């Protein structure tokens, strides 16, 4: 019943920092590993120290060093903290090939070591970003190997969705297009969120006009914990990760369920207001709490999964579902009946001490696969096209051995993906 | 992971004098060589620029090169000239005299072998080089002349390392050497294809900034080279220190170069205003972005809104929100969409470091690659042609064996860069 | 059994301030929402805090800020407090169109959120003023949307009637004429009062020669509470808001019942004097207590509703009615028999601590639809005409996209309305 | 929500010197720049006129413009000249000399580009502008000449913002420049159609008030400009602070302008009487209304009962009953019905603010738009014609290129405003 977390790149690792901090908060784990009390994620020592079963990869020493100098440096095993010396430079060509390919063997052997520590490997999940060099480059490299060795294990990916308006990486389209090509075909499911959309959540629901990544990742951590800690904890409907895959992936392509999370409420907003299960789920179908800037009303739904924490009575859930099925404007694709996975954990929602979110007594996470995602690809299509037509920055990949045909090909694969969304949109 | 820096020419040597000063400031390293800081980070990534010698002495990984001992001596005589080891002072005797031919082609060429040997010794001292940086003037004899020669050999030895250089570009008003455009022309001919990237610094623009926004009436070159070092140091510290974004020089180079030949940069810097107004300034991300976008805060005598922007890098130092940065950069892109090139979606890229420059809460470095740069080339090329026809001072150069057809090709090559900027100006 | 209050504009909000203060006084609600004890208006939290189901709209931050800095800032949910940055400038053209139309979507979504919080939305009522920019401009904009979404819910409006003698808004006729045009057709019933008439009440019955709006709105609040708090509380004849509409609106045009309220008595005037139900109702048919400067004797009655608080025995009421039907000079329109709605609540009348009105043991509110209202329109007709003939101030509307024909049209709609009153006056 | 103010000409600069002083008084802001008040409201809406710079420094959102450093210097030398940032002092060198042509047409025109650039910088610094205000003299070179030029460009950039100005109108007795009516004529020609509204201040009337009701025998321009600032500050504070009525400048503009071209105002102010009588005064709403209606308390040398009143605004500061205000305004309308225009029912409009001016319990600002205003235009037009025929000083103006037919059209336009006042005088 075990799983492995993999943190690649800054985004992967810094999100991971929040994630493991939250898992410590879930059980009262001390920075040194001492836990007085979740062995699905952790491995126990004779001292009662538990080791989070995870791998941290950075090709630049700095971020891992940040871990190594922080409080959780005692928690993590030195072998889990893997670092190279040089970067990918925002570039798949080095991340996947030239540079990252050198260290990956080590990385894999640490993974395999942990796989041998697992007794019942259920699977794993990889945290990264769609635009970066290691964030997406190295990441896909890893998938190429992991899908061989662990072909039957859960291969869930979580990635930051490139913001349409702000991006620090000029060749991000190129990176992301190459990842599509290689991840679609290897991964089982990839989830993503938009930091821009999140900012809007922070300013509207948390009332914060100063979000940093350390805020943004707390919110992400919430979502992740709902599906990682609480799915291993007790509930009414205990849903596994493999079950998630078995209930969220409808086609052999990928699919890309997007996150939505409600409650996201400031402490003051929690006052004077009573949420019910149904009210929280109402919020879950509002564009306003959509974690990716993509309009839910534009597309049609294919999948939807609702996962519940704390004070949730199935009775209320059932009523809530009835209304979301019938009251809303949620259009859905023919193919699908509304079999929405309901996970119901008794495990209460948790809050980070010193965080922004209010203590809540119940909480709902929503995953959804909508046809509007093709518009996200359309965004990438043109951004890629523009660059590629001019061949701007192309020498930074070509010099590492990339082929122009390959890039065209990858775009075409994306186009095919868009076409399959088109297909799904056609009802039948 | 490490960088080697080589300074050359009177300009380059004096700029480096400020550069290294700042780097040691950043890390708390005393003018005599030992570390007396007070932050973990200060020593943590020191390796990129210093070798720790026995006794907790730090040796700046750089070579000081000239052909006149006196300049070298003056450098050595000040604080931080003592931190450099004697072995990093490589110099000859008898000038160059601001003559490319002497520097590159003949006499200075002789010295380069000893320089390179020391370079090799340092390349071995490093664990893993990220790259090299050189400081010099485009119209100078050793600055460009000898310096260029060195670059061609270093690149040859290390194709896989970053080769960049910062150079003083002849300002429209103050040329010193009559053939300064000639030397510059020759350096383009050699440098552009033998470098990964070059930065364009105009002293005239710098003198305007120092009075325009800084309202100063006494600067010297040390004060202006302080500003230069602010941009240079800004770039590498992030690479050195923990941040949020993507802090690798090579990745910067990748994001800023859309085409093999067009790698010229316009540095700018924020915040950068007089003390009077400091009581009336607010420190926000939009505040920095206002200063960064404004052409008057550019250190290059160009005008980015005249040309088109190919690439923009915004590097931030200090604690800022990601949201705010993202939004303001987007806004910039939006509002100045008429200057950006349509081929590159979201042409403004960012990098974020969480360490502020000593004494400030926040700061930002503007790096741009516009088409406007071509205007500098045009000015030089034109001036060159006139001189070319007359052979002004070319007897000095041809006397040392420089052939006019080589110069002819150099002229073409200048014109080629302009035409390629036009090819992507659209 | 729930309802929504909507406060638009200063007038709407400042009146609302008095209204919600009174509701707090009705139940002992603390500024923080803590109530130790009316859930038709309030929504309960787990802390026992109740939230008044209302929306506050101001396009200028200041008045809402006044709320936000007062004691009731703890009572109101931050989302209920909606503010823009700029004003309508006394001008429908900006209030309804150019400016207010930008924010209204937010406003509506907060309303809809509350509508979803309602379980049995009975309806709502809107507080505003006939002359202002947001007071009437924005207001009608809102009605345009609310009448779609909540077409079957109560749409009661309350508005300040422009004083014939004092008005601070030079284009008030123009504003009010435009509202007629758009409110008549959308709203169900609009009530109004005249601050000038009220001043006369304050100086004659309360003996106060220094009324401010904070006095004036207390009196308004009294009237409103009689029909809002006490209609949800227990009585003999418990009358609902929908019942009010069903008992006050005779035609599909609008109608405009005017308020009259008796008792309005200073503490000293209460001494030495014993009011009965009948005596209070006698006062209700006196011009002297008419809250709008319009002569009750001029027109004919069409509707009349009497609502009773405290110590009222139907027995006495019946006798009182007999005398008002037969003793008075109240002429009434043929169409109507005297079926005057009698609401009889046991709920006692309440008084604001530190207010001007005397503690009373019983109280009567009167609503009435008289044909004399056409004279009010006549006032507007000429005021509008004068301005419009000269085209004074016209550029302040035209520049926002208003049409001159439209203005003529709106006047004509008013003329038609006057003609319908003429019609009703003709007995048949 | 915010306002930008620009001062120009010696007049405008000295008026603004008092204006800003008062605004800072209103908010408890020290002459050096920091906030040392004591009321929540004092900071709460400060944004309309101040930028808070780092350190809790407030920067007045205004530009000081002149063509002689010495006037600017004298402004800067006093308290509150230190609160302005150096960047708000935009000036040239060599006067204008009270010459429209220089100011507008030629030389001053050159400076305007730098002024406007700063304007743009401030427009960006604001979140949302409500409008702009300018202070100047109608018969002055930079006051009107250069100032007008600026206005035409600002309006162009921001059609959707309020453009108003307060200006010193040549008093019948004291003209300084021989062609002061010429400059004024030209400013009408340009301003009227390039502004939303303009206020008419007569120094002669002001000197009468200061002795007539205030019984003072020593005023200077600073004392009279205090009175000016009282009216200016009166208007904007309400917009800033909580009140009862309708506190928006644009709404004021809407209520006061019945016709696109007739937007001239007569400011007045109450209470405004000597200390002796202050022991014999009662403070009631009728008391303020008596002072407001009385023509002698007008700051414009007009006579509203000679003309007809188109619009009246009564702004009140401090706690007053609504009833009392309503009734007294009605009474005014009733008793002075012979002066009001019959086309506008209830021509007297009100605005109410609950914050009194510092030191007073209550106050009121009178703003009127009568037909009487045309008399000022008539005086100028006539004087103009005489000069026009002789070309007095027009060689200075034509020497700088100003054409006489442009002046001819200006004359017509003056006459047009008069005829339109007649058209609505009836
Ligand atoms: N939510 C979130 N997004 C982040 C975080 N850090 C970076 N990102 C986003 O991820 C992308 C940045 O990737 P980089 O940091 O440049 O690169 P990397 O993927 O770590 O790998 P390299 O390019 O080789 O350094 C941008 O789109 C950022 O907005 C973080 O902590 N949280
Ligand atoms: N009874 C009562 N009447 C009020 C109050 N405030 C204002 N009024 C009246 O309502 C009208 C004023 O509307 P304004 O305050 O100018 O404007 P608004 O309707 O709030 O909206 P804007 O014009 O955009 O500011 C006048 O006729 C006032 O006499 C109040 O608190 N109580
Ligand atoms: N910014 C800057 N420019 C310099 C300095 N010294 C010389 N220059 C510039 O360099 C050019 C002259 O070349 P120089 O450095 O004397 O050549 P070299 O010494 O023979 O290699 C002129 O354009 C100068 O403005 C300096 O310390 N700082
Ligand atoms: N109220 C007032 N009027 C002034 C002041 N200064 C000059 N004036 C008037 O302005 C006119 C002269 O224009 P001036 O301001 O010198 O023009 P400029 O300086 O060339 O733009 C005369 O009618 C003066 O009465 C002042 O400080 N206050
Ligand atoms: Mg990284
Ligand atoms: Mg208002």
Query: Which of the residues A10, A61, A62, A389 would you substitute to probe the B interface, choosing the one with the greatest number of B C-beta atoms within 10 Å?
Result: A62
Burial class (CB in 10 A: 0-12, 13-18, 19+), B347: buried
In 3-state terms chain B splits into helix, strand, coil percentages (rounded to 5) of: 50, 20, 30
Cβ-Cβ pairs closer than 8 A, A with B, add up to 152
- Return the closest-CA partner of residue B130 out of B313, B26, B253: B253
Longest alpha-carbon distance in chain D: 61
Tell me, using a 6 A CB cutoff, whether residue A84 lines ligand 1: no
Please give the biggest Cα pair distance in chain A: 61
Question: Which among A134, A131, A203 is positioned nearest to A166, based on CA atoms?
Answer: A131
Q: Is C168 on the interface with A (CB under 8 A)?
A: no
Q: How many angstroms separate the CA atoms of C26 and A235, rounded?
A: 45
What's the start-to-end Cα distance of chain A, in Å? 39
Residues from chain B that touch D57, judged by Cβ atoms under 8 A, are: 279-280
Question: Do C198 and C223 touch, CB atoms closer than 8 A?
Answer: no
The residue ranges of DSSP E strands in D289-347, in sequence order, are: 309-317
CA-closest candidate to residue B176, choices B391, B410, B393: B393
C-alpha span between C330 and C321 (Å, rounded):
12
B191 in Cβ contact with B156 (< 8 Å): no
Judge whether C308 and C316 are in contact, CB under 8 Å.
no
Which region holds residue D359: left if phi is over 0, alpha if psi is between -120 and 50, else beta?
Answer: left
Q: How many CA atoms lie within 13 A of C42 on its CB side?
A: 23
Structure tokens belonging to residue B338: 């008429």
Residue B9: which of B149, B200, B113, B205 has the closest Cα? B149
Phi, psi of D140 (to 5 degrees): -110, 155
Q: Looking at ligand 3, which residue's alpha carbon is closest to its atom 12?
A: B140
C-alpha B377: how far from its chain's center?
Answer: 17
Cβ neighbors of D359 (< 8 A, separation 6 or more) are none
Do strands B89-91 and B197-201 pair parallel, antiparallel, or not at all (unpaired)?
A: unpaired
**Which H helix or E strand runs over B133?**
strand B129-137
**Residue linked to tokens 């849903």:** A239
Helix (H) or strand (E) holding B163: strand B162-168
Task: Note whether D54 contacts B277, CB cutoff 8 Å.
Answer: no
Mutate: best of C10, C18, C60, C62, partner D, most D CBs <10 A: C62
Name B259's Cβ contacts closer than 8 Å, sequence gap at least 6: A391, A392, A393, A394, A395, B420, B424
Residue of chain D whose alpha carbon sits nearest to that of C135: D246
DSSP for residue A371: T
DSSP string, B49-116: TEEEETTTEEEESEEEEES-HHHHHHHHHSTTSSSS-GGGEEE-SS---S-HIIIIISHHHHHHHHHH
Please, what is the Cα angle at C136 between C134 and C139, to 5 degrees? Answer: 75
Resolution in angstroms comes to 6.0
SS3 A4: strand
Strands of the sheet containing A362-370, edge to edge, are A81-83, A54-58, A2-8, A121-129, A154-161, A189-194, A258-262, A362-370, A301-310, A341-345, A235-237
Residue D185: DSSP 8-state: H
Report the C-alpha gap between C82 and C110 in whole angstroms: 9
Cβ-contact A265, A359 below 8 angstroms: no
Concatenated DSSP letters for A44-108? E-TTSBEEE-EEEEESSHHHHHHHHTSGGGTTS-TTTEEE-SS---S-HIIIIIITHHHHHHHHH
Is the peptide bond prior to C275 cis by the omega test (within 30 degrees of 0)?
A: no
The secondary structure of chain A in percent helix, strand, coil, rounded to multiples of 5, reads 45, 20, 35
Ordered structural domains, chain B, with CATH: 1-258 (3.40.50.1440), 259-372 (3.30.1330.20), 373-426 (1.10.287.600)
Asked if B415 and B381 count as a contact pair (C-beta separation under 8 A), the reply is: yes
The answer to the question of whether A97 is labelled as a binding residue is: no
In chain A, after which residues does the backbone break, taking C–N over 2.5 angstroms as a break?
Answer: 37
C-alpha–C-alpha distance, residues A227 and A259, integer Å: 11
Indicate which residues of C carry an active-site annotation: 243
This structure was determined by cryo-EM
The answer to whether the beta carbons of residues B136 and B170 sit under 8 Å apart is no
Specify the 3-state DSSP secondary structure of C309.
strand
| The pair of three-digit structure tokens given for residue B424, joined into one six-digit string | 């992507």
Residue whose CB lies within 8 A of the most ligand 2 atoms, among C6, C9, C11, C195, for a mutation test: C11
CA–CA distance, C125 with C188 (Å, rounded to integer)? 10
**Is there a contact between B258 and A88 if contact means CB atoms under 8 Å apart?**
no
Q: Strand, coil or helix: what is B311?
A: strand
CA distance B237 to chain D (A): 26
What does DSSP assign to residue D336?
T
- CB proximity list for C249: less than 8 A, separation 6 or greater: C188, C189, C255, C303
User: D86: buried, middle or exposed (CB in 10 Å: 19+, 13-18, 0-12)?
Assistant: exposed
List the alpha helices (DSSP H) in D193-220.
203-212
What are residue B413's phi and psi, to 5 degrees?
-60, -35
Whose Cα sits closest to atom 30 in ligand 2?
Answer: C11
Q: How far is residue A339's CA from residue A301's CA, in Å, rounded to a whole number?
A: 11
Q: How far does the CA of residue C232 sit from the closest CA of chain A (Å)?
A: 22
Q: Are residues C109 and C117 in contact, defined by beta-carbon separation less than 8 angstroms?
A: no
In whole angstroms, give the CA distance from residue B329 to residue B352. Answer: 13
Q: Which one of the ligands is nearest to A63 CA?
A: 5
- Nearest ligand 4 atom, CA D147: 21
Establish if A329 touches chain C: CB-CB under 8 angstroms. no
Around D15, how many Cα atoms within 13 Å sit in the side-chain half-sphere?
Answer: 30
Question: What is the separation, in whole angstroms, between the first and last Cα of chain D?
Answer: 38
Contacts of B304 (CB under 8 A, 6+ apart): B266, B295, B298, B339, B368, B370, B372
| D150 in contact with C, Cβ within 8 Å | no
**HEC states along D20-86?**
HHHHHHHHCECCCCEECCCCHHHHHCHHHCEEEECCCEEEECEEEEECCHHHHHHHHHCCCCCCCCH
**DSSP code, position A349:** P
Decide: helix, strand or coil at residue A346: coil
How many residues appear in chain C? 428
Active site residues of A: 243
A260 alpha-carbon distance from chain centroid: 12
- C-alpha span between C122 and A50 (Å, rounded): 58
CA of B204 to the centre of ligand 3 (A): 12
DSSP C94: I
Instruction: Tell me the DSSP string of B180-199.
Output: HHHHHHHHHHHHGGG-SEEE
DSSP 8-state code for residue A167: -
């Amino acid at each position: 019943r075990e799983c492995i977390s993999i943190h690649v790149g800054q985004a992967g690792v810094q999100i991971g920092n929040a994630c493991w901090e939250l898992y410590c908060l879930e059980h009262g784990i001390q920075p040194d590993g001492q836990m007085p009390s979740f062995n699905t994620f952790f491995s126990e020592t004779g001292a009662g120290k538990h080791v989070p079963r995870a791998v941290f990869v950075d090709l630049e020493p700095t971020v891992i060093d940040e871990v190594r100098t922080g409080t959780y440096r005692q928690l993590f095993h030195p072998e889990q903290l893997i670092t190279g010396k040089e970067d990918a430079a925002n570039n798949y060509a080095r991340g996947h090939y030239t540079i990252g390919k050198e260290i990956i063997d080590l990385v894999l052997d640490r993974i395999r070591k942990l796989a041998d520590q697992c007794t019942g490997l259920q699977g794993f999940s990889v945290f990264h970003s769609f635009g970066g060099g290691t964030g997406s480059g190295f990441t896909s490299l890893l998938m190429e190997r992991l899908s061989v060795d662990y072909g039957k294990k859960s291969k869930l990916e979580f990635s930051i969705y490139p913001a349409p308006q702000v991006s620090t990486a000029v060749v991000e389209p190129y990176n992301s297009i190459l990842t599509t090509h290689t991840t679609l075909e290897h991964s089982d499911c990839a989830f993503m969120v938009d930091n821009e959309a999140i900012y809007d959540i922070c300013r509207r629901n948390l009332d914060i006009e100063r979000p940093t990544y350390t805020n943004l990742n707390r919110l992400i951590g919430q979502i992740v914990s709902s599906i990682t800690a609480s799915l291993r904890f007790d509930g009414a409907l205990n849903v596994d990760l493999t079950e998630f895959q078995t209930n969220l992936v409808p086609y052999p392509r990928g699919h890309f369920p997007l996150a939505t999370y409600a409650p996201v409420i400031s402490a003051e907003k929690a006052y004077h207001e009573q949420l019910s299960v149904a009210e929280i789920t109402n919020a879950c179908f509002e564009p306003a709490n959509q974690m990716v800037k993509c309009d839910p009303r534009h597309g049609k739904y294919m999948a939807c999964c609702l996962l519940y924490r704390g004070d949730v009575v199935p009775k209320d859930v059932n009523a809530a579902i009835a209304t979301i099925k019938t009251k809303r404007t949620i259009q859905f694709v023919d193919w699908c009946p509304t079999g929405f996975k309901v996970g119901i954990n008794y495990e209460p929602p948790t809050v980070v001490p010193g965080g922004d979110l209010a203590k809540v007594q119940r909480a709902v996470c929503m995953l959804s696969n909508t046809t509007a995602i093709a518009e996200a690809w359309a965004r990438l299509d043109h951004k890629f096209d523009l660059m590629y037509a001019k061949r701007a920055f192309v020498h930074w990949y070509v010099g590492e051995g990339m082929e122009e045909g390959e890039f065209s090909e990858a775009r075409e694969d994306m186009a095919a993906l868009e076409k399959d969304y088109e297909e799904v949109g056609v009802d039948s | 992971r490490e960088i080697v820096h080589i300074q050359a020419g009177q300009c380059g040597n004096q700029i480096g004098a400020k550069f290294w000063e700042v780097i040691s400031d950043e890390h708390g390293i005393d003018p005599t060589g030992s570390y007396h800081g007070d932050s973990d980070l200060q020593l943590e990534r020191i390796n990129v620029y210093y070798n720790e010698a026995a006794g907790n002495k730090y040796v700046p990984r750089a070579i000081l090169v000239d052909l006149e001992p006196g300049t070298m001596d003056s450098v050595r005589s000040g604080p931080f000239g003592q931190i450099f080891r004697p072995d990093n002072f490589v110099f000859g005797q008898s000038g160059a005299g601001n003559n490319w031919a002497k520097g590159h082609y003949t006499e200075g060429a002789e010295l380069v072998d000893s320089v390179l040997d020391v370079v090799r010794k340092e390349s071995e001292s490093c664990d893993c080089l990220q790259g090299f940086q050189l400081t010099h003037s485009l119209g100078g004899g050793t600055g460009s002349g000898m310096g260029t020669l060195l670059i061609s050999k270093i690149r040859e030895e290390y194709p896989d390392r970053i080769m960049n250089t910062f150079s003083v570009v002849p300002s429209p008003k103050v040329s010193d050497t009559v053939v300064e455009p000639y030397n510059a022309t020759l350096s383009v001919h050699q440098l552009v294809e033998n470098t990964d990237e070059t930065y364009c610094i105009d002293n005239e623009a710098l003198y305007d900034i120092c009075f325009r926004t800084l309202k100063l009436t006494t600067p010297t070159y040390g004060d202006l080279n302080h500003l230069v070092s602010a941009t240079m140091s800004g770039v590498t510290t992030c690479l050195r220190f923990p941040g949020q974004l993507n802090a690798d020089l090579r990745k910067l180079a990748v994001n800023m170069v859309p085409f093999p030949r067009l790698h010229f940069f316009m540095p700018g810097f924020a915040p950068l205003t007089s003390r009077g107004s400091q009581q009336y300034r607010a420190l926000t991300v939009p505040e920095l972005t206002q200063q960064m976008f404004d052409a008057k805060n550019m250190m290059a005598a160009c005008d980015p809104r005249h040309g088109r922007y190919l690439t923009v890098a915004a590097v931030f130092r200090g604690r800022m929100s990601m949201k705010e940065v993202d939004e303001q950069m987007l806004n910039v892109q939006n509002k100045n969409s008429s200057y950006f090139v349509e081929w590159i979606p979201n042409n403004v890229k960012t990098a974020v470091c969480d360490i502020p420059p000593r004494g400030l809460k926040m700061s930002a470095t503007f790096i741009g690659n516009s088409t406007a740069i071509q205007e500098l080339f045009k000015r030089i090329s034109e001036q060159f042609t006139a001189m070319f026809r007359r052979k002004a001072f070319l007897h000095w150069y041809t006397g040392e064996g420089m052939d006019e057809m080589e110069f002819t090709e150099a002229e073409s090559n200048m014109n080629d860069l302009v035409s390629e900027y036009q090819q992507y100006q659209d």
